Ligand binder design. Structure first.
Ligand SMILES: CCCCCCCCCCCCCCCCCC(=O)OC[C@H](COP(=O)(O)OCCN)OC(=O)CCCCCCCCCCCCCCCCC
Ligand SMILES: CCCCCCCCCCCCCCCCCC(=O)OC[C@H](COP(=O)(O)OCCN)OC(=O)CCCCCCCCCCCCCCCCC
Ligand SMILES: CCCCCCCCCCCCCCCCCC(=O)OC[C@H](COP(=O)(O)OCCN)OC(=O)CCCCCCCCCCCCCCCCC
Ligand SMILES: CCCCCCCCCCCCCCCCCCCC
Ligand SMILES: CCCCCCCCCCCCCCCCCCCC
Ligand SMILES: CCCCCCCCCCCCCCCCCCCC
Ligand code: SF4
Lengths: 100, 309, 101, 162, 169
């Protein structure tokens, strides 16, 4: 009784909001937060699609998605801590040394 | 306005409310019992009145929402985790298909009370003590679920009534003994009970996170801790000691006897055991209890698959 | 859509609502009444918790369907748990889980 | 299950909109936790019970705990970003908001016009997910263990103190 | 009795504050070691020891950190008046800078004298009027002028005739 279009539109809205947060925020922590919003939105879209078809593959894709989300959040926060302890500054525009 | 469907839903709602009120009052009475063993109901009512009519002082340099939100989490997390516990046939709040997973959800949310209290209490020492306490609770929440997973493997489902029915012949304390001891250790360590009381006592650069909480927020932390040990005891009963199943007594009598026995045993091991060092606690968790839960799950699966012709 | 399931849904909803409202009312009554007048090891243990919690979720999914998967599922989960334990042994031996070096 | 889906989707959208435009990291992480709980309620409304349970257990109970840990240990007390609030200036956010709105419009136009019998919302249990996970998706499980090992090794090598 | 600057529940509030008293025992000096929670949670401060000038600010600060309603019990001659130390480095009494509700003579007092002081403080709490809320009603605290313990106990004390001789144990 819940349309597939509505669930996919909700997932698309969350994905777009996470991408906007990734773009407009200069702090690296908020960039990681936007990345987490984007990957959670894509996982929600997989769950919506799997629930529409009555298949378990959507939740399996969700499980792989959140495995990726956990591991890359760990890596990104480790790199954030390294940047903080090497520069005392989380500005992502300051770490821009290599240029064309 | 008379219909048996409305009567049924009203009676189920009334049963849920009765269960909730009995759990809260039992948590308060267990706080009284620990304070006395280490009228009384009138003294607890006096304590509640005093904490109500004492002024609630939020610190000036403290974040109000996080400071207010930490005791709410500390109460409501395990108080809501109780909702899956079947105390009697026909006396369960929610017959959820996820069950013990709902308990794991609530414990994972329960770590936020410690983190939020430490951050909002604007003090570096309190922050460091909360970081140590949260590291300890993560170190034991890492294997809480697997210690339950042995029993889940034996039952074949996450539903609690199915676990109670699968303990009809032999209670799960006998086959899942290592799951039982690991779940007891993890449940004590998640609720910050003795011997995992004060991880900040190993350093003078740290302080407890309950400091700067005055009056009703401190009361929320106190009653939330005791309600947490009540629901941990009830989960222990329903997962390892048959739940409500017994030969002669009514089922609620058996469940209440086992839960009261486990609450008294938690009081006894608080009064008896000494607290180990912090690094000893972390090493014991990560190096002993997690591999023991994994090996117990493997052995349980092998025994189940062998005993299926 | 039976009577029992909707009764338990209403009972669970009332349990959650009355619980959260009881905590809220406790704080409201406390506030209204009465007169007036770091180290990187924490990151390491939290990250280890996250990784081993995801691997625990895989074992959560396995544990509820052991009989339906048979011995083949046992072999696959045994390989999973072996890789998990080898990672744990590696973390212990390199001093990652050693709190006092 | 319909009203729950719509109200939880609304709460999730509002919470993440508050996340991306907030200055306090702990407040933003709290709103992110609220959005994750709302998304778990969305999962429960669609019958994906295992997915909602893991959304609270793992996403709102492990990953966001790691984020809160990092925020608390770095102690963001307004290090030359809170006192500026450059993302609230129109020239910084107006452009990317237009770009994201265009992307959302194109995606939503693609969503519409697709045949839809509706989501049944019937509960797909964790037993069925476990059967599929250790049945036709075995190598996914084993290489996901390898993926988490890779993340573990990378995060230890980069994030250790010495 | 006179008082110095809707009824049943006020009595219940006084009963709750009376039967629930969480003390903060300040060490200070030998009175505490005879007798042997955070100041935010405590509602009673028991000052028992010599008020030195170097830690009178410590006493004042830890008293200011407490939250209303708050009561003070001063144990021993040092906390009452300075005691035997009328000297340059000693504040002559706790009540020089913070208000004291109950005084106990002695050097040191016995622990059951501290229990007696707790009983007296319980009566004083039970016979006092405090504001119910910070938005409704009068925001004034009415301490009751209790009859002194020496006027109350005068008859039984003066009636004493003979005592045991000090030649025995
Ligand atoms: C300050 C307040 C902050 C917010 C607090 C919480 C807000 C919401 C409170 C109102 C809730 C209203 C009732 C919700 C529905 C209850 C019934 C329900 O969930 O039923 C659905 C499902 C039933 O499953 P089952 O019975 O097994 O099978 C039937 C076959 N279809 O059962 C399930 O799917 C069960 C799993 C879902 C259970 C969710 C429980 C609440 C989780 C959030 C806790 C928040 C804790 C405090 C804050 C933490 C930090 C932010
Ligand atoms: C099987 C269950 C294994 C659980 C291992 C849990 C663990 O972390 O154990 C730590 C243990 C001791 O390590 P540690 O204390 O650092 O050693 C100092 C001694 N000089 O570590 C050990 O004892 C080493 C691990 C031995 C087993 C794995 C390595 C060999 C495997 C060969 C194939 C089988
Ligand atoms: C009310 C206005 C807003 C007020 C503030 C926010 C409060 C929380 C609002 C969202 C959560 C409650 C929504 C209402 C749920 C009511 C119960 C319901 O709809 O149950 C139906 C269904 C039961 O399952 P099923 O068996 O499939 O039903 C068909 C029957 N054959 O149920 C399901 O399938 C699943 C039911 C939902 C999942 C469980 C609850 C999730 C809670 C998420 C909380 C998110 C954080 C909220 C924070 C609030 C403060 C900012
Ligand atoms: C510490 C224990 C907490 C228990 C909380 C729930 C209490 C529920 C009480 C239910 C009582 C009636 C049970 C059904 C009838 C069988 C027993 C009859 C004699 C009491
Ligand atoms: C039905 C009874 C079967 C008994 C024999 C079971 C053993 C034979 C089949 C084993 C299959 C194991 C597959 C494991 C794949 C691991 C891949 C790892 C990739 C990194
Ligand atoms: C120093 C450079 C900073 C660049 C920040 C990102 C700017 C992105 C602008 C995108 C605008 C798109 C508008 C629609 C076409
Ligand atoms: S009154 Fe006597 S016993 Fe008490 S602190 Fe003073 S000197 Fe010590």
């Amino acid at each position: 009784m819940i349309p597939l279009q509505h669930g996919l539109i909700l997932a698309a809205i969350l994905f777009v909001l996470g991408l906007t947060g990734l773009v407009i925020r200069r702090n690296l922590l908020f960039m990681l937060i936007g990345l987490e919003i984007m990957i959670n939105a894509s996982a929600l879209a997989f769950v919506v699609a799997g629930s529409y078809w009555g298949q378990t593959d959507g939740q399996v894709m969700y499980i792989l998605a959140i495995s990726l989300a956990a591991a890359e959040a760990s890596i990104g926060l480790a790199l954030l801590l390294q940047l903080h302890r090497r520069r005392q500054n989380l500005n992502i525009d300051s770490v821009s040394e290599m240029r064309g | 306005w008379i219909s048996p469907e409305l009567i049924e839903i009203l009676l189920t709602i009334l049963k849920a409310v009765v269960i909730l009120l009995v759990v809260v009052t039992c948590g308060a009475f267990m706080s009284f019992g620990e304070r006395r063993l280490l009228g009384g109901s009138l003294q607890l009512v006096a304590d509640m009145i005093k904490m109500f009519f004492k002024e609630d002082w939020i610190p000036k340099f403290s974040d109000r929402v996080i400071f207010t939100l930490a005791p709410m989490i500390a109460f409501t997390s395990l108080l809501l985790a109780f909702a899956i516990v079947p105390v009697s046939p026909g006396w369960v709040v929610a017959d959820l298909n996820i069950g013990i997973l709902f308990f794991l959800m609530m414990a994972g949310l329960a770590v936020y009370a410690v983190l939020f209290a430490g951050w909002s209490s604007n003090n570096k020492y309190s922050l460091l003590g909360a970081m140590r306490a949260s590291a300890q609770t993560l170190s034991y929440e890492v294997f809480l679920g697997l210690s339950l997973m042995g029993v889940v493997a034996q039952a074949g489902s996450f539903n609690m009534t199915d676990i109670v029915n699968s303990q009809a012949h032999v209670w799960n304390v006998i086959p899942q003994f290592f799951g039982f001891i690991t779940f007891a250790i993890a449940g004590v360590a998640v609720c910050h009970r003795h011997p995992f009381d004060q991880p900040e006592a190993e350093q003078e650069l740290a302080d407890g996170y309950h400091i700067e909480y005055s009056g009703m927020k401190f009361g929320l932390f106190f009653v939330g801790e005791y309600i947490g040990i009540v629901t941990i005891s009830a989960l222990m009963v329903t997962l390892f000691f048959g739940g409500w199943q017994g030969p002669l007594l009514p089922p609620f009598i058996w469940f209440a006897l086992k839960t009261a026995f486990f609450m008294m045993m938690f009081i006894l091991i608080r009064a008896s055991l000494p607290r180990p060092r912090y690094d000893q606690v972390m090493s014991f968790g990560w190096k002993i209890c997690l591999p023991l839960t994994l090996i117990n799950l493997l052995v349980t699966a092998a025994v189940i698959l062998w005993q299926a012709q | 859509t039976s009577t029992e399931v909707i009764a338990h849904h209403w009972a669970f909803a009332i349990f959650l609502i009355v619980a959260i409202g009881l905590c809220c009312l406790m704080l409201v009554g406390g506030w209204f009444l009465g007169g007036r007048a770091l180290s990187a090891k924490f990151y390491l243990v939290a990250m280890f918790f996250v990784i081993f919690d995801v691997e625990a979720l895989y074992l959560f999914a396995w544990s509820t369907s052991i009989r339906e998967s048979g011995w083949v599922g046992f072999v696959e989960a045994a390989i999973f748990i072996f890789v998990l334990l080898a990672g744990l042994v590696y973390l212990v031996r390199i001093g990652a889980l050693d709190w006092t070096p | 299950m319909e009203f729950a889906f719509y109200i939880c989707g609304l709460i999730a959208i509002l919470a993440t909109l508050r996340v991306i435009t907030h200055t306090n990291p702990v407040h933003a992480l709290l709103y992110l936790i609220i959005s994750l709980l709302a998304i778990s309620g969305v999962f429960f409304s669609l019958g994906a019970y295992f997915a909602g349970a893991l959304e609270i257990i793992v996403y709102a109970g492990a990953i966001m705990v790691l984020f809160v840990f990092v925020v608390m240990m770095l102690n963001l007390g307004g290090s030359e970003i809170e006192q500026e609030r450059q993302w609230l200036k129109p020239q910084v956010w107006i452009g990317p908001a237009i770009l994201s709105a265009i992307m959302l419009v194109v995606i939503v136009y693609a969503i519409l016009g697709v045949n839809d019998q509706g989501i049944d919302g019937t509960p797909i249990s964790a037993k069925a997910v476990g059967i599929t996970l250790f049945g036709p998706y075995v190598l996914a499980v084993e290489l996901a263990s390898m993926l988490l090992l890779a993340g573990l090794v990378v995060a230890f090598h980069v994030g250790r103190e010495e | 009795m006179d008082y110095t600057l809707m009824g049943k529940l006020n009595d219940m509030v006084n009963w709750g504050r009376k039967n629930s008293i969480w003390p903060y025992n300040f060490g200070l000096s030998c009175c505490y070691v005879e007798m042997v929670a955070s100041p935010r949670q405590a509602d009673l401060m028991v000052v028992a020891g010599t008020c030195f000038t170097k830690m009178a600010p410590v006493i004042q600060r830890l008293y200011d950190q407490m939250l209303e309603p708050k009561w003070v019990i001063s144990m021993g001659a040092c906390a009452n008046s300075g005691g035997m130390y009328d000297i340059y480095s000693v504040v002559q009494g706790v009540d020089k800078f913070i208000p004291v509700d109950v005084y106990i003579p002695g050097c040191p007092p016995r622990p059951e004298a501290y229990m007696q002081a707790l009983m007296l403080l319980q009566e004083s709490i039970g016979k006092e009027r405090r504001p119910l809320s910070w938005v409704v009603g009068d925001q004034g605290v009415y301490r009751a002028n209790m009859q002194s313990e020496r006027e109350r106990k005068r008859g039984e004390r003066i009636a004493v005739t003979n005592l045991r001789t000090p030649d025995e144990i």
